[PDB]
Design a protein around this ligand. Structure first.
Ligand SMILES: CCNC(=O)C1(c2ccc3nc(N)nc(C(=O)N4Cc5ccccc5C4)c3c2)CCC1
Length: 192
């Protein structure tokens, strides 16, 4: 388990997301589905140079909403450096300007609804990694000794006690149909 500090910009952004009163918290899903779509586009665009989909797994017991994709995945180098550089440039752009995704920092909208976010990832020529952050100015990165998932990303949202609506079938179905209705990959909503 390695702990890293977020950079000043990203840290300030997450603080802004968590401490700012904003009721349209449902934007987080569009942002994460979009990110999955790009990762899936990356493994698809690389293929020409197996199954490409997105799964939405709610869990009442653990109080989690998971967004799984079979996209390109991420390396340790992607988790530490790379995501941090993308975010440095992104936060800079989003500050000068709900429109969060246009600046490549839409993932962090997850903190509108999650108290902790766990990111299990696997890239084709690297190991399985687990990224985790409860915001608070830091993130951890470890090698996942957990169940070997296939190439892709698993974004596990540990929902706030008050944000349990994002566990309901009707609600997930309504958000998807509203802002992710033209994604080029099948989106499966798991039941309970
Ligand atoms: C397609 C273009 N992107 C890439 O190549 C990267 C990449 C590749 C696969 C990805 N898969 C998903 N599902 N999501 C993301 C993502 O943008 N984030 C996940 C995450 C976790 C912690 C903190 C911030 C973020 C933002 C991915 C990013 C390589 C580095 C960016």
């Amino acid at each position: 388990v390695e702990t890293f500090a977020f950079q000043a910009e990203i840290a300030q952004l997450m603080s802004l997301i968590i401490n700012t009163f904003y009721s349209n918290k449902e934007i987080f899903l569009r942002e994460l589905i979009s990110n999955s779509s790009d990762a899936l586009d990356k493994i698809r665009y690389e293929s020409l140079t197996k199954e490409l989909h997105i799964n939405l797994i709610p869990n009442k017991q653990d109080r989690t909403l998971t967004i799984v994709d079979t996209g390109i995945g991420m390396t340790k180098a992607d988790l530490i450096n790379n995501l941090g550089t993308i975010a440095k440039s992104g936060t800079k752009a989003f500050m000068e300007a709900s429109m969060i995704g246009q600046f490549g920092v839409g993932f962090y909208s997850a903190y509108l609804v999650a108290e902790k976010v766990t990111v299990i990832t696997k890239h084709n020529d690297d190991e399985q990694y687990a990224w985790e952050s409860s915001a608070g100015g830091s993130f951890t990165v470890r090698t996942d000794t957990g169940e070997p998932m296939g190439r892709g990303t698993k974004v596990i949202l540990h929902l706030k006690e008050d944000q349990t609506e994002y566990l309901e079938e009707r609600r997930i179905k309504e958000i998807v149909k509203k802002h992710s209705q033209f994604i080029g990959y099948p989106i499966t909503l798991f039941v309970e």
